[PDB]
Design a binder for this molecule. Structure first.
Ligand code: NA
Ligand code: NA
Length: 326
DNA sequence: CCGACGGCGCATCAGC
DNA sequence: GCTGATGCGC
DNA sequence: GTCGG
């Protein structure tokens, strides 16, 4: 929090770029700057100081100078008071409502949740679900609840077919104390890249989770990817648990561990690992790890039966998810 | 100076 | 009706 | 907005 004022400012700017100006690359520039500053172990004294950090350029250095000298940023103060812009930025907090929808809603007088609640006919299925669980979705998930959630998912999956293999990834797998949602990767030996997916392997699992009333709503659902809502059972006489976001992806057996590695992260570790792999003559993406010829031509994907197989290929020591913060 | 900044499944729109 | 583009989330 | 070829 040494530079909380600065990081808060950059993050607020980031959101407006993304949600109002629809400049996704500026949104990411601000996030990157906020992150690099968030890790800086010194209270910044000037923009020049910050500019030394990778990601902080001329413009943000200038903004830090204004912030340090006046305690605010005129442009941010102005945008905050802007009725239209602050409303557009806000509505995007609803899952299903992006920059385009938020803009159209505000254009026609729909600026608040209350307004949204009054206009169900103008919201698609996803947006209605997002509105319904607006507050719940913004709540984090204690690891204890994530464990109780994993218990149900693993049990039911095995119940449908003991040959299914399911892994809850994300920061949770790395040991995080809280999570924002639940990411589940699923596979079955019967499903490979060059075989049939028996368009129901995913369906059968989603169905069982709905049957035991764990999954409560569906945002989207196809043959390989499910996105929805779930909720832990409440103990009689206790405030019921908040609804949570859960995604389930069915991945071909031969690409499963590249998927688990990828969705376990962190993002920083993935980049570092991808870099190391390249210098070792290997190209790793979320699906496979392939060899690179001397002319840069990628060969066919290499056999992978575990996360370690991946590490072994790039002569890197297997690292526990708990040690993949970077 | 000026292009990259990940890119793909699903729901829905837009053009035919 | 079918096909490709767009919005969205991740 | 920032970086870099
Ligand atoms: Na810099
Ligand atoms: Na949204």
């Amino acid at each position: 929090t040494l530079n909380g004022g600065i990081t808060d400012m950059l993050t607020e700017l980031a959101n407006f770029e993304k949600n109002v100006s629809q400049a996704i690359h500026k949104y990411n520039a601000y996030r990157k700057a906020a992150s690099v500053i968030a890790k800086y172990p010194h209270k910044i004294k000037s923009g020049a100081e910050a500019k030394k950090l990778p990601g902080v350029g001329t413009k943000i250095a200038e903004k830090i100078d204004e912030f340090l000298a006046t305690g605010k940023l005129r442009k941010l103060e102005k945008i905050r008071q802007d009725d239209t812009s602050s409303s557009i930025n806000f509505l995007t907090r609803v899952s299903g409502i992006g920059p385009s929808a938020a803009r159209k809603f505000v254009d026609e007088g729909i600026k608040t949740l209350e307004d949204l609640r009054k206009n169900e006919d103008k919201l698609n299925h996803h947006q209605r679900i997002g509105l319904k669980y607006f507050g719940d979705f913004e709540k984090r998930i204690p690891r204890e609840e994530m464990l109780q959630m994993q218990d149900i998912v693993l049990n039911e999956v095995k119940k449908v077919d003991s040959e299914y293999i399911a892994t809850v990834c994300g920061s949770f797998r790395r040991g995080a104390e809280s999570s924002g949602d639940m990411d589940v990767l699923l596979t079955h030996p019967s499903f490979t890249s060059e075989s049939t997916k028996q368009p129901k392997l995913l369906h059968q699992v989603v169905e069982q989770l709905q049957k035991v009333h764990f999954i409560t709503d569906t945002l989207s659902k196809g043959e390989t990817k499910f996105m929805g809502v779930c909720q832990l059972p409440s103990k009689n006489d206790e405030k019921e648990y908040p609804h949570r976001r859960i995604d389930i992806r069915l991945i071909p057996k031969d690409q499963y561990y590249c998927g688990v590695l990828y969705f376990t992260g962190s993002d920083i570790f993935n980049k570092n690992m991808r870099a190391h792999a390249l210098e070792k003559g290997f190209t790793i993406n979320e699906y496979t790890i392939r060899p690179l010829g001397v002319t840069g031509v990628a060969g066919e994907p290499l056999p992978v039966d575990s996360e370690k197989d991946i590490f072994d290929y790039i002569q890197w020591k297997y690292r526990e998810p708990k040690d993949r913060s970077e």
